[PDB]
Design a protein around this ligand. Structure first.
Ligand SMILES: Cc1cn([C@H]2C[C@H](O)[C@@H](COP(=O)(O)OP(=O)(O)OP(=O)(O)O)O2)c(=O)[nH]c1=O
Ligand SMILES: [Mg+2]
Length: 720
């Protein structure tokens, strides 16, 4: 009797294994999916209509997103070949059908390793792991990370991961399989470039590059510009130290004229970033605040493809705080201020002052408030503390570090002959919480060892866009291991972000990563010898990052014994740790970004023409299981900008747990950054969230960060 309303309900019901059926209701999906109408429709339109329908119910319970993903994945599975070696073969044999030209999508060398070991590699893969993404993390993979033939996905998520593994580990099949298992289980992820390009020809595997301007001359300026344009060709973020370029109106000997300053120079850099965007290039431009063009620099963005950062010496900060004057200089009149830091900077700068080699004197506080006025409008410039960066860098023996990278986590040496490179991965901190609410530190360490070994192998396979990058990387072998899902780990342990329980876990997590990392880096040194510039470095003198912060680790790990291992063998890598923003990879694994708390408990994702409302999944489980969740409450939470603090019916323990970043003290945020920072040998990407900007309050956040010892005081300022 008409009927046939279940039928499709059963198809949906089939993929609900393990979901919370108190809130997931297949019939609800079918009521919208039916309206399926059509005589000419089949088993392909629903699956995509049911997946979309399930995904909009993510606001009723999080398992709807898991159901949406299973529907979408099983659908992808039937439009895809199962066998890995066969997808790689088709990727290689791709003839671009309308230019005629053979255009292989994987490297011949990769495919040949694959075909030579297909039985082991094909059978190592477990396709049910493709079902472990939530809908939105799957659609991100589908959009950018799975190779397409015809505009039709050929790679399963498993196929992509296995390519990446073989791409990294080559003929080492044991390694490749181990890394496959870690990645497919989600214990860590490689950074986006690695996922895109490993196993391909053109394996541009790195994330960001750092440059110093070659010299203060048209010649110099345009070599650097070229270098930037070549790097931009290959998935490059860029940081550029620009302080050695002479100021506006300074004398040019050879044309008897006057320099045009930084601004019109940077117009060229800005247009090169717009122009070379693979076909959206972004350069971060780093200036020291003594440079005479500082005011015009802080007023420009008010240059859309440039991002601005101050490389700040302690002296400037002391001058601001004691209300003294601040001398602005042209680097051509006063050379080498950017080649030197700390005492040696303060003395040389002071000496130019005593000589009256000064182009303008301002009150330090006039410049200070130009800076924070800039930050209020654009949220830039980024605030980096030059002297902290150098004082606590294991690359010290190389010389003064002139800048950081696009996202402020990388503090590495650069020069005329060297472009610094960021080789990146992240650990998924939430995955290490046991089902018994304890933190598995030993597994964390063991995973970090694997990441180190992979990042070292990447240094050696990478396609470098300029030879100065290659030289840099091979000489010092730095690596940047970050994290994601710290907020999620806290919540899974039931710790409020500001609680003493989290503050200790926070310190222990990062003791552990630095420990494992050093341990693998030392094991690699035993096998292959220390990196070339290791003799001289603070680590070669028995000094580790925490010693530079005058911090004593907790009792969790035996540092005495590691130091003996390092004293004997050295380490393979000049630097190891750098919590980066993880914007794209966090969105794939379904964690919150990096070290950041949840910015809001309700947020939207776009998926093509779709717009989806998502509730903090930890929160939504808590609210649903306490019979508190309904639509009228969702709308109250939206009306309070994602806060649950003024909703009377939520118990105060959950309110503590689900504070948004706006409601968490930024002083605490900056403090925990300094505390884990003692075990981070580079820096960390650290935004400040102040609800409504207040010049006094911002000045006070900056000085707190500076005094805590942070290398990066502030990435972006966010106001809402
Ligand atoms: C030639 C030129 C230089 N400049 C700036 C950019 C460089 O930082 C700076 C020096 O340019 P240079 O090309 O070095 O000029 P120069 O060879 O005369 O060198 P010097 O004066 O050192 O003896 O002048 C302009 O702004 N516009 C110009 O047209
Ligand atoms: Mg010159």
């Amino acid at each position: 009797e008409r009927v046939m309303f279940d039928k499709i309900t059963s198809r949906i019901q089939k993929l609900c294994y393990g979901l919370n059926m108190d809130f997931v209701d297949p019939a609800q999906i079918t009521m919208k999916v039916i309206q399926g109408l059509y005589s000419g429709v089949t088993t392909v339109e629903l699956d995509t209509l049911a997946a979309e329908t399930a995904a909009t119910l993510t606001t009723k319970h999080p398992d709807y997103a898991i159901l949406a993903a299973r529907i979408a994945v099983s659908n992808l599975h039937k439009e895809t070949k199962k066998v890995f070696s066969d997808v790689m073969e088709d990727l290689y044999n791709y003839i671009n059908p309308h230019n005629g030209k053979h255009s292989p999508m994987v490297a011949k060398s990769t495919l040949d390793i694959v075909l030579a070991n297909k039985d082991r590699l094909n059978s190592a893969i477990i396709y049910d792991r493709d079902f472990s993404y939530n809908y939105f993390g799957f659609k991100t993979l589908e959009r950018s990370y799975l190779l397409k033939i015809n505009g039709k996905v050929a790679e399963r998520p498993q196929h992509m991961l296995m390519r990446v593994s073989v791409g990294i580990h080559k003929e080492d099949i044991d390694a490749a399989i181990e890394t496959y298992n870690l990645l497919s289980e989600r214990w860590f992820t490689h950074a986006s470039p690695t996922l895109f390009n490993a196993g391909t020809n053109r394996p541009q595997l790195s994330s960001c590059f750092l440059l110093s301007m070659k010299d203060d001359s048209i010649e110099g300026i345009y070599d650097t510009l070229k270098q930037c344009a070549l790097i931009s060709k290959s998935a490059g973020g860029i940081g550029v130290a620009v302080s050695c370029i002479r100021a506006t109106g300074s004398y040019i000997a050879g044309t008897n004229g006057n320099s045009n300053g930084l601004v019109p120079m940077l117009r060229v850099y800005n247009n090169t970033a717009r122009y070379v965007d693979q076909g959206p290039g972004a350069f971060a431009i780093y200036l020291e605040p003594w440079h005479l063009d500082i005011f015009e620099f802080l007023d420009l963005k008010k240059a859309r493809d440039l991002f601005f950062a101050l490389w700040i010496p302690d002296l400037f900060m002391k001058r601001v705080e004691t209300n003294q004057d601040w001398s602005l200089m042209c680097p051509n009149e006063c050379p080498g201020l950017d080649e030197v830091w700390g005492e040696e900077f303060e003395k040389l700068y002071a000496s130019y002052e005593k000589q009256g080699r000064v182009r303008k004197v301002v009150k330090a506080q006039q410049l200070w408030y130009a800076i924070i006025e800039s930050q209020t409008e654009t949220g830039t410039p980024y605030m980096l503390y030059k002297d902290s960066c150098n004082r606590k860098s294991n690359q010290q023996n190389l010389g003064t570090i002139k800048c950081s990278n696009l996202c402020t986590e990388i503090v590495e040496y650069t020069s005329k002959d060297e472009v610094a490179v960021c080789n990146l991965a992240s650990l998924a901190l939430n995955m290490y919480v046991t089902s018994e609410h304890t933190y598995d530190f030993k597994k964390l360490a063991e995973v970090t060892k694997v990441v180190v070994r992979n990042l070292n192998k990447i240094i050696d396979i990478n396609y470098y866009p300029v030879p100065e990058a290659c030289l840099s990387n091979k000489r010092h072998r730095p690596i940047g291991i970050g994290v994601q899902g710290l907020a999620d780990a806290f919540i899974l342990m039931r710790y409020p972000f500001e609680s003493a329980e989290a503050q200790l876990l926070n310190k222990q997590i990062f003791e552990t990563i630095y420990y494992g990392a050093l341990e693998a880096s030392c094991d690699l040194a035993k096998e292959q010898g220390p990196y070339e510039t290791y003799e001289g470095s603070p680590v070669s003198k028995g000094i580790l990052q925490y010693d530079m912060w005058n911090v004593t680790p907790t009792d969790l790990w035996d540092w005495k014994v590691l130091k003996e291992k390092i004293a004997k063998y050295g380490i393979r890598n000049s630097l190891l740790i750098a919590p980066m923003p993880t914007a794209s990879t966090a969105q794939i694994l379904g964690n919150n970004e990096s070290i950041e708390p949840y910015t809001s408990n309700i947020y939207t994702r776009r998926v093509l023409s779709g717009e989806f409302q998502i509730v903090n999944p930890h929160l939504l489980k808590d609210l649903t299981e306490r019979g508190l969740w309904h639509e009228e409450m969702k709308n109250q939470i939206i009306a309070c900008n994602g806060s649950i603090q003024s909703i009377p019916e939520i118990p105060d323990d959950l309110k503590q747990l689900y504070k948004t970043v706006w409601e968490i003290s930024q002083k605490t945020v900056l403090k925990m950054a300094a505390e884990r920072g003692a075990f981070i040998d580079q820096s960390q990407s650290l935004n400040i969230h102040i609800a409504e900007p207040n010049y006094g309050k911002l000045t006070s956040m900056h000085f707190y960060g500076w005094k805590q010892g942070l290398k990066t005081g502030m990435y972006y300022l966010r106001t809402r």
